[PDB]
């Protein structure tokens, strides 16, 4: 089977700057019939792959003209003249010359943008959940950049460790920011033994740490 | 174009048949292909079928793992995977090889079917409110198996400012996620917010109204 090698495997670009991705095949993709069956695909977060161009450089209608492809034989390049926010995702080359079809390992395209501070929200556990034996306290950090963030939980001012879990969204396809959730998980009994619950957020966009807190049982 | 069947939870060693319903074009004029996505950046072509006569062509890596069929009456393609192992858990896509101006390429794709090979049983999530110039509110979708769950707000009419986080695994071995939305604080009290949660593997459909406490 043809081995498709892509270069680089990940790259970050500022909106408006050019981007290039290289693909090298283990054999010339020139078929005996004259055509060169090299395809480029884009996969956005959560969606199916989508053809950008076929036969090296022929664009599928509806693909913006800022995408272009070139190369021949064993070396091919995908270029985006000016990157837009919606271009984030994973890019694949696909050869259709030699049975069987083979893809390269995708190249991930990330957007660089300016620092943006998160807005921070804290949610107490619901009474419904407390009716079972567990309490989940959620801290939300919304629409920030870069991805790196420190979220610390304090319960009655005691730093928590080993009982919280984070989830980070993919980069937003519109403003290129991230959002993050931190969930502190406690038994109902541990939750009921304390008063002040706080998440403290440290981030490049904040001149100093931000704290959001509540008192258990004070609506 | 192409509508694939819903997510599957399959025991190791069992088999599974997933489907791809075609509409709005001449089903028998185009190859249907299937593609495996095992990790975030891994795509493998499985094989193709000619829906007119059922003729098939397999990636040799899949000739025993997968069987492709069609039903011409219902313009539906099928891929059956046999004797599943954990290596078969993945998202599987069907795609149409269409043609534009004399050239052929994959011009239509289904949205993917998630197959989870597992010995464990299905469990629906419980849904708890995350109660609220900008306010945030949300829904905590807790303790379900397998993936996926989908979350929408106000039946799809509320999309701006929505973040549905990737599921995380808990110490119980079950998934959990939150979906949140940021809205004007001035709308809390006049505007109703409902997260619609759907976990198809368990036939769980929940609508949870989220209000300030």
């Amino acid at each position: 089977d043809i081995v498709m090698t892509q270069t680089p495997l990940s790259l970050s670009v500022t909106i408006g700057q050019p981007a290039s991705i290289s693909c090298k095949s283990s054999q010339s993709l020139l078929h005996s019939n004259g055509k060169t069956y090299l395809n480029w695909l884009q996969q956005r977060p959560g969606q199916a792959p989508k053809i950008l161009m076929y036969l090296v450089s022929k664009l599928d209608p509806g693909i913006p003209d800022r995408f272009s492809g070139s190369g021949s034989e064993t070396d091919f390049t995908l270029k985006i003249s000016r990157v837009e926010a919606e271009d984030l995702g994973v890019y694949y080359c696909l050869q259709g010359t030699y049975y069987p079809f083979t893809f390269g390992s995708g190249t991930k395209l990330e957007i660089k943008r300016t620092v943006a501070a998160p807005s921070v929200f804290i949610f107490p556990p619901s009474d419904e959940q407390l009716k079972s034996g567990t309490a989940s306290v959620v801290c939300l950090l919304n629409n920030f950049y870069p991805r790196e963030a420190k979220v610390q939980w304090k319960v009655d001012n005691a730093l928590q460790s080993g009982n919280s879990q984070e989830s980070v969204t993919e980069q937003d396809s519109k403003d290129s920011t991230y959002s993050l959730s931190s969930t502190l998980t406690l038994s109902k009994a541990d939750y009921e033994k304390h008063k002040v619950y706080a998440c403290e957020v440290t981030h490049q966009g904040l001149s100093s740490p931000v704290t959001k807190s509540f008192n258990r049982g004070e609506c | 174009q192409l509508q694939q069947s819903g997510p599957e939870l399959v025991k190791p060693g069992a088999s599974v048949k997933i489907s791809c319903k075609a509409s709005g074009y001449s089903f028998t004029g185009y190859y249907m292909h299937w593609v495996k996505q095992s990790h975030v950046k891994s795509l493998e072509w499985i094989g193709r079928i000619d829906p007119y006569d059922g003729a098939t062509s397999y990636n040799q890596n899949f000739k025993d793992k997968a069987s492709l069929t069609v039903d011409k009456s219902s313009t539906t393609g099928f891929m059956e995977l046999h004797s599943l192992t954990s290596e078969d858990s993945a998202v599987y896509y069907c795609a149409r090889e269409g043609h534009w101006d004399g050239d052929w390429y994959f011009d239509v794709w289904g949205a993917g079917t998630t197959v989870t090979v597992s010995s464990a049983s299905t469990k629906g999530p419980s849904v708890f409110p995350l109660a609220p110039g900008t306010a945030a509110l949300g829904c905590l979708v807790k303790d379900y198996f397998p993936e996926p769950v989908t979350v929408s707000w106000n039946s799809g009419a509320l999309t701006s400012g929505v973040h549905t986080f990737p599921a995380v695994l808990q110490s119980s071995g079950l998934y959990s996620l939150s979906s949140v939305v940021t809205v004007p604080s001035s709308s809390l009290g006049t505007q109703t917010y409902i997260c619609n949660v759907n976990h198809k593997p368990s036939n769980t459909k929940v609508d949870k109204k989220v209000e300030p406490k």
């Binding site: 078929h31 019939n33 069956y37 050869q95 259709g96 010359t97 030699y98 049975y99 069987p100 079809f101 083979t102 | 001449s26 028998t28 004029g29 185009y30 190859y31 292909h33 072509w45 193709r48 000619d50 829906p51 007119y52 062509s57 090889e97 043609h99 052929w104 390429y105």
Partner: peptide
């Protein structure tokens, strides 16, 4: 009309 496709889809 009958289906056609890129050659990598068939052993021939």
């Amino acid at each position: 009309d009958r289906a056609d496709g890129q050659p990598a889809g068939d052993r021939a």
